[PDB]
């Protein structure tokens, strides 16, 4: 059970 | 030899997408709780043998048998991946103001390994993002 | 979040792993004694945990999360303590660890939305 | 094998 967040992402 | 620049691919079941709404970035409970409702959706619903083709850019589905692209998302427009046991789910669209997302359900026993690479795929790309433009 | 699983029973209680564990075996007693399960799907939400017949899609149990203590996923069967005093639900599921996970990560959301209406910034 | 508690619980108890 792990997750992962694209932080690029957060800025398009 | 191929590597994470040039992509690197693993053999998955595609399950089937679903859709959902979130905030700008929500928590990470919340994105597991959201990838949890995806399988959800598709479990309480229910095939094709795919090739993932991960990339520091790319994230393709390809048709195993026929190599065919049935899927292709760039990299930035992925906000979450999460694996849950044998089950991977891939989501496309203080941050970005948007709501509706695009969840992908796969099936692989490299679940791990998947999500392990294209967080890898999100980190080199950031850090290229950052040092790129200034930050 | 909605999952399929079998009702097997429920005990009461007057650490809790092992409360679970006797839950478990208390059933698989009962169950082991009338045999020589009822088809429900349990609704999962940050606001409260809904049992409903698979069939009649009929509300069986309803219990608002901070009611509810602890969740325990024992191989193939998950325990629900929620508060003769507590009581145990005992489900049968082939996504048992996955209800469990799930239950436990509404939890985290609920406890930070908990936590946000307080004053104190989760 | 698996168990977990609610951190909320504690308060309305």
Redesign the interface.
Known sequence: ?12 | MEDLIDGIIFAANYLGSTQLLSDKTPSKNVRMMQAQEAVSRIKMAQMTEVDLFILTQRIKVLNADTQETMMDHPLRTISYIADIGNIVVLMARDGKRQYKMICHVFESEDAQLIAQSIGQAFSVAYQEFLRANGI
């Open positions: 059970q792990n997750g992962y967040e694209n932080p690029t992402y957060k800025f398009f």
